[PDB]
Each structure stands twice: as C-alpha cells, then as structure tokens.
C-alpha cells in the first residue's frame with residue numbers, strides 16, 4: 001500500500017473514484033495486492049467474473065461464485081463497483097453465438113441481463129451494458145447480436161438494464177476512443193446522440209484507454225469529443241499505458257480531472273505481473289507490488 005491514496009486525492013477534486021480491477025485470485029495471491037486495493041483505490045471492476053462465459057456457461061444456467069466474491073469484497077471494504085460486462089462479442093459462450101432466430105436471441109439477451117443485474121441489484125454503481133460494439137471506422141461491429149437482432153439490440157439491452165436496476169449508471173464501453181477526430185470516436189458520438197434522441201437510456205460512455213507510450217496527451221481531446229455525445233457522464237474504464245511513464249499517466253489523470261463529465265478512472269490492474277499486458281509494464285505498481293514513479297507523480301498532481 002502507498003501511504004498517499006490517489007483515490008482520496010482524486011475524490012478531493014469532486015471525482016467519484018480512481019479505482020482498479022480484481023477477482024478472487026489477485027485479491028488473494030499475496031498480502032500486498034488486496035492491501036493496496038483497500039488503501040489507494042475506491043472502486044473495483046471484476047476483471048473476468050461477470051462476463052458471459054463466466055456467468056452463463058450454459059443456456060439458463062448461471063455460475064456466480066467468482067462474481068459473488070468480487071462483489072462481496074468490494075461491498076465489505078467500501079469500494080464502488082462497475083459491473084462488466086453484459087453484452088459483448090468476446091468471451092461469449094458458443095451457445096449464444098450459434099442462435100439464429102431473432103426472438104430467441106432477444107429472449108436470451110434479456111434473461112442474461114436480468115439475471116446477472118438482479119443478483120446485484122442496488123450494489124452496482126455502473127454497468128458496462130454494451131462492450132466494444134464498434135468497428136474502428138465507427139460502424140457497428142457485426143457480432144451475433146448485431147447480425148441476428150440488428151441495431152435494435154442496443155435499445156433492448158439498455159431498456160432492459162434500466163428497468164432491472166434503475167439505480168445503476170448504464171454505460172456503453174469501447175477502446176480506441178483515445179484522440180479527438182478518430183473515426184471510432186466520431187462513430188461513438190454520432191451513434192450515441194441518435195440513441196439518446198430516440199430515448200435509449202445511456203447514462204455514460206466508457207473509454208477503455210489502453211495506451212502505448214506517449215499517447216497520454218491526446219486523451220484530453222478525446223474526452224472532450226466524447227462529451228459532445230450528450231450523455232450525463234463518461235469515464236476512463238480500463239487504463240494502462242505501456243511504459244507507465246509519469247508524463248503519460250499524469251496527462252491521462254489531468255484529462256479526466258479537467259473534463260466535467262469524467263466521473264472517474266479505473267486502472268486495468270494493480271501491479272505489472274498481473275497485467276493482461278504484463279510485458280509492457282503498464283500499471284502503477286511493479287513486480288514487487290510497490291508504487292512506481294507514475295503513482296507518485298499522479299499523487300503530486302492532485
């Protein structure tokens with residue numbers, strides 16, 4: 001645990017949280033990891049336990065052991081929770097992607113959203129309802145949901161989520177929304193404006209922010225562009241930067257800090273060894289679960 005909590009310092013500026021991710025393994029693999037989580041971060045996203053493959057491996061049969069644990073740990077230690085993720089083309093069981101009948105897929109979609117959301121009703125701050133539904137050019141990704149249901153699955157998913165747990169912030173999450181003017185950013189903005197105009201309950205836009213070295217400085221403009229979609233809020237949801245330089249990290253923190261709509265930042269992991277991009281050492285803590293320079297830089301920037 002770092003003496004100074006960047007979450008505490010971020011919240012001091014009116015932000016909701018500066019959090020990270022977890023699940024049974026990382027929360028129990030050693031003493032430092034969970035201790036770092038409770039001391040320096042104020043929100044948790046299950047790294048894998050809430051995905052479709054992990055929650056509904058077979059049609060109508062749910063497995064909630066991993067997610068229950070993550071939720072219970074967060075709830076027991078005062079951490080906000082971002083559910084992740086309800087509708088996604090990846091980590092999706094084959095039984096879903098093989099469905100060809102529109103009404104059957106809609107029924108399955110709704111039951112999955114309903115069951116997973118109902119179990120944690122009232123405990124989730126935000127839900128990444130939809131994940132990565134855009135192609136890089138801004139057009140809709142041809143996943144099973146898009147191909148079988150058509151664009152209406154967007155309305156269906158959000159409306160179902162809204163009715164199931166009206167207390168949660170409903171989000172659409174995606175990566176590569178990292179610089180203003182980028183085709184995917186333009187596509188995210190125009191689509192959300194349209195959906196919001198049609199009455200679709202989209203509360204926020206989540207920008208993953210999986211960056212390479214030196215890309216931190218363009219994030220501020222990206223957030224500014226995303227703010228034009230018209231959602232109540234936006235958030236950096238899965239932040240990690242190859243090289244984890246202070247300049248990049250502080251640039252990204254400032255990007256959120258200076259944009260009214262950005263409610264928080266979630267770093268995709270605590271320490272480098274547990275990163276899904278470990279070879280690039282993209283996190284705030286190192287192989288010894290000790291604060292890296294960027295962590296301190298962030299703290300001194302707040």
Ligand SMILES: O[C@@H]1[C@@H](O)[C@H](O[C@@H]2CO[C@@H](O[C@@H]3CO[C@@H](O)[C@H](O)[C@H]3O)[C@H](O)[C@H]2O)OC[C@H]1O
Nearest residue numbers: 047048054084085090131132175208238275276
């Ligand atoms: O066997 C499973 C692993 O293969 C799997 O690894 C995770 C893959 O997803 C990573 O999280 C995503 C990163 O990219 C974005 O598109 C998503 O929104 C994130 O959810 C995660 O970091 C890897 O650990 O999951 C664990 C095993 O079940």
Ligand SMILES: O[C@@H]1[C@@H](O)[C@H](O[C@@H]2CO[C@H](O)[C@H](O)[C@H]2O)OC[C@H]1O
Nearest residue numbers: 090132175176208209210211212277
């Ligand atoms: O989850 C993956 C994404 O990671 C992938 O795009 C990645 C995102 O971050 C990666 O490190 C890299 O910068 C991008 O190419 O796109 C497919 C999606 O399922």
Ligand SMILES: O[C@@H]1[C@@H](O)[C@H](O)OC[C@H]1O
Nearest residue numbers: 068071072119120121123
């Ligand atoms: O453990 C579960 C809890 O996490 C959920 O919120 O409510 C139902 C319980 O079974």
